[PDB]
Design a protein around this ligand. Structure first.
Ligand SMILES: Cc1cc2nc3c(=O)[nH]c(=O)nc-3n(C[C@H](O)[C@H](O)[C@H](O)CO)c2cc1C
Length: 175
């Protein structure tokens, strides 16, 4: 099982799209490409993907089975991704959700996400949830909008700098 603790972030460098899937070539951060190889199953934005090819710090994943309930087909070259290598999150993304709002501040970012009933209707505060590979506790909830707090230090190792109103994220429902 995964911790939902992002070890570092990669940058999508290449994306070859074909009729069935898309081959994403992700440039990994120093130290992470040495910990994986072909057949390695890891978490990219919290989604279980299998390394299909690797050369230096360029890691490739064929993204297909996940294309329909994930955010991958909407990412482009240059985008940052959260990365986690195995040793809680299973890596099976339930679906996609949008950032309803986001309030930055000294401490960190209070991000509001509108969770559709299609993903889960039985959410309670204090529960954990995975957003793009980051496991966080639901600090607050009102109907379908949940509130999660992001520590500012995350900007150094995660993709969170891309969160804005209406930005789509991978959601994994826990427990
Ligand atoms: C071991 C394992 C490997 C997987 N590899 C891929 C993959 O290479 N490409 C993909 O699109 N989906 C893959 N999936 C499915 C995806 O990670 C995710 O769980 C769901 O597709 C989200 O709807 C994999 C799932 C597991 C359990």
């Amino acid at each position: 099982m995964f911790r939902g603790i992002v070890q570092g972030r990669g940058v999508i460098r290449s994306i070859s799209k074909s009729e069935d899937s898309q081959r994403h070539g992700i440039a990994f951060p120093e130290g992470m490409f040495q910990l994986v190889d072909v057949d390695t199953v890891m978490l990219v934005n919290g989604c279980s993907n299998t390394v299909v090819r690797i050369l230096g710090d360029m890691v490739y994943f064929d993204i297909d089975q996940a294309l329909g309930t994930t955010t991958f087909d909407g990412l482009k070259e240059g985008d940052q991704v959260n990365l986690e290598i195995h040793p809680g999150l299973t890596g099976n993304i339930k679906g996609t959700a949008l950032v309803a709002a986001i309030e930055e501040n000294d401490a960190g970012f209070s991000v509001l996400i509108d969770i559709p009933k299609g993903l889960a209707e039985n959410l309670t505060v204090k529960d954990d949830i995975g957003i793009d590979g980051i496991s966080l506790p639901i600090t607050d909830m009102s109907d379908s909008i949940i509130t999660l707090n992001y520590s500012r230090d995350l900007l150094a190792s995660t993709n969170i700098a891309s969160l804005a109103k209406d930005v789509k994220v991978n959601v994994e429902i826990l427990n």
